[PDB]
């Protein structure tokens, strides 16, 4: 009977215990496992995290579950009887908040093979926090990670591993704003040693190649437009003394409005970026416009034309020297 | 499983968060043919809305659900109707915050096919069909 099948598996007559690891008084348990991502993304700037939805496949051997009653090799079971059997104690190091999904059923797959190998899969939503190096923020490749880790068992009881072939899966169609998920993924061995002892760790490496399509039109073009707007200060009549003063001061306030309109979702981090120094050097060039004319105002006739001769032609040639200089260094 | 949704408050489409909070009822029907009876001659017969955990249930979820929960307000809001032969009418109330990947090339004139995806998890296609 199918009712009598679980009577020999679990329950009273079985004598099974779920509180004991498999292969007790002996070898540890290696766990071949991988993640099935669903909605990766929502990378936050200030909060410095990302909300990911995954399934978590894992496999091991529980060799005290042999049976010769029903000849089926692969055999699914009840998705709520998983609390009546042994389970690994994995968590995530920078999980920052996580929960199950009991929507209409415990979303908790449990597949038992013929010999005692167990296929297992559960659905977990995370908000993993990655320490992100943001020296060149619009051109960064951020290896934001997760770290699986056992807690209630040491390394003489439980080992985490990856899969020998295909140790990570990406569900198709996952396209992201400002991001692409790079296909090659490093899967190395972290290891935790605590005061309790040796703990097994495994981790993934998600290289986030940032798509700069937002900050070009939104940030770079308003930084580009106002700098060349400062050049028409150096072409108007010299009797425009209340007129030239109305150009540079408003536009340096506009670049201050650009600078104040550039740090909304941005975190508060100590070290300097590449996105902000472009704002500052564009702030300095529009700052550079009127003290040229204030140096003219102490001179002010053709002598003042000489100091404008440096600025009427040479200064609009004095902007591309840094723009080419910008994209060479911090492109890697 | 023949099934459909009974939407209540569709909407609240977010721009930055890229989701929408919807309130639905979820009708579904199937056959449980080991529940035959000839005692009471009623064809349609409602039952206790809290005994549904004592019977079989499908394992549906939503792919881009982004956060969801039941509604135990004054009673498990969980309808359970059993026919005479063994067909089961079933209905529960679920609030979702479904996230749709929205193509926004023309944002003030877009037609956004924002979707939900029902999906079985603890059973393969040799066990359960939606």
């Amino acid at each position, epitope marked *: 009977s199918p009712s009598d099948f679980l009577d020999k598996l679990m329950g009273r007559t079985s004598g099974y215990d779920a509180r004991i690891r498999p292969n007790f008084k002996g070898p540890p348990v290696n766990v071949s496992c991988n993640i099935f991502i669903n909605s990766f993304g929502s990378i936050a700037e200030t909060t410095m995290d990302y909300r990911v939805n995954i399934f978590l496949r894992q496999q091991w051997n529980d060799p005290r579950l042999a049976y010769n009653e029903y000849p089926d*090799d692969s055999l699914d079971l009840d998705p709520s009887m998983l609390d009546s059997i042994w389970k690994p104690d994995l968590f995530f190091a920078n999980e920052k908040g996580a929960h199950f999904h009991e929507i209409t059923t415990d979303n908790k797959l449990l597949r038992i093979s013929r010999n005692g190998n167990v296929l297992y899969s559960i659905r977990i939503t995370l908000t993993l926090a990655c320490p992100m190096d943001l020296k060149n923020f619009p051109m960064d490749v951020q290896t934001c990670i997760m770290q699986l880790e056992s807690f209630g068992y040491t390394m003489n009881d439980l080992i985490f591993e990856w899969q020998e*072939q*295909g140790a990570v*899966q990406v569900a*198709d169609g996952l396209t992201l704003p400002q991001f692409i998920l790079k*296909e090659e993924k490093d899967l190395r061995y972290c290891t935790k040693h605590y005061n309790t002892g040796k703990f097994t760790c495994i981790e993934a490496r998600f290289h986030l190649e940032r798509q700069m399509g937002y900050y070009l039109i939104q940030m770079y073009i308003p930084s580009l437009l106002i700098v060349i707007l400062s050049w028409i200060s150096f072409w108007i009549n010299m009797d425009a003394a209340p007129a030239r003063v109305g150009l540079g001061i408003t536009t340096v306030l506009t670049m201050t409005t650009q600078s104040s309109g550039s740090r909304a979702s941005l975190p508060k981090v100590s070290y300097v970026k590449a996105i902000d120094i472009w704002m500052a050097v564009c702030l300095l060039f529009v700052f550079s416009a009127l003290l040229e004319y204030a140096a003219v105002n102490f001179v002010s006739i053709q002598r003042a034309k000489k100091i404008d001769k440096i600025s009427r032609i040479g200064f609009p040639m004095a902007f591309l020297i840094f723009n080419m200089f910008y994209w060479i260094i911090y492109k890697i | 499983v023949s099934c459909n949704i009974f939407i209540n408050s569709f909407g609240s489409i977010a721009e930055t968060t890229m989701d929408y909070r919807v309130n639905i009822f979820l009708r579904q029907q199937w056959n449980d043919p080991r529940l035959a009876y000839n005692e009471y001659p009623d064809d349609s017969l409602d039952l206790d809305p809290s005994m549904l955990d004592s019977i079989w249930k499908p394992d549906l979820f939503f792919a881009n659900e982004k956060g969801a929960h039941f509604h135990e307000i004054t009673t498990d809001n969980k309808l359970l109707r059993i026919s005479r032969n063994g067909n089961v009418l079933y209905s529960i109330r679920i609030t979702l915050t479904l996230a749709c990947p929205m193509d926004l090339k023309n944002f003030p004139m877009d037609v956004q096919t924002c979707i939900m995806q029902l999906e079985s998890f603890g059973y393969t296609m*040799n066990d359960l*069909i939606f």
Partner: antibody
Amino acid sequence: VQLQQSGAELMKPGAAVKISCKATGHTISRYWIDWLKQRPGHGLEWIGEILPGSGSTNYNEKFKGKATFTAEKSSNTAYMQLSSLTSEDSAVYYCAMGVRGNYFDYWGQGTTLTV
Amino acid sequence: IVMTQSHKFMSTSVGDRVSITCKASQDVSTAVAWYQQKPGQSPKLLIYWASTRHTGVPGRFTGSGSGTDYTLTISSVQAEDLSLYYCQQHYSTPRTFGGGTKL
């Protein structure tokens, strides 16, 4: 949506060859790809399975160590590589794709190989 | 997992009743598939799960059978029906096909 294969080949006994399956319409790593062996005189004979995103397989008991399943995500192409060709292996092969179950409804066009 | 049909050929005329008596090894399921392969082209699905049909299917072909017996029932035979037939179990990991029957 229908699959596509390259031109049929011809080999000598004891050799090894790869069979390509170009996919037109979608990303082939989403769905399964299976393989069937049609030796004439006899009939069809299933080989294995591959999810091209994972490469996880279940080869047949009679076909243990027979086929090699790889995939090409750069152009949506599935690969089946054989080994140790004998006179029992002259057959017709198929890359199929059966969606709602273990049966088969989408196909390519067929490739005949003779040892 | 051994499949067993009855005949490779059955002689009949156009517009008759003809059925295929496939048989599986044990009671796998009602997971029974029927494949028709015309010469020169690919094998095509007829019936899956022993009762259902394809999109764009020949509608004059029916499926039945349960337990240890399964049947592709054809009560209407036309001129294009001269082809091959196969049965299948798909309730296991090996996909063991039937014996084969050309009309």
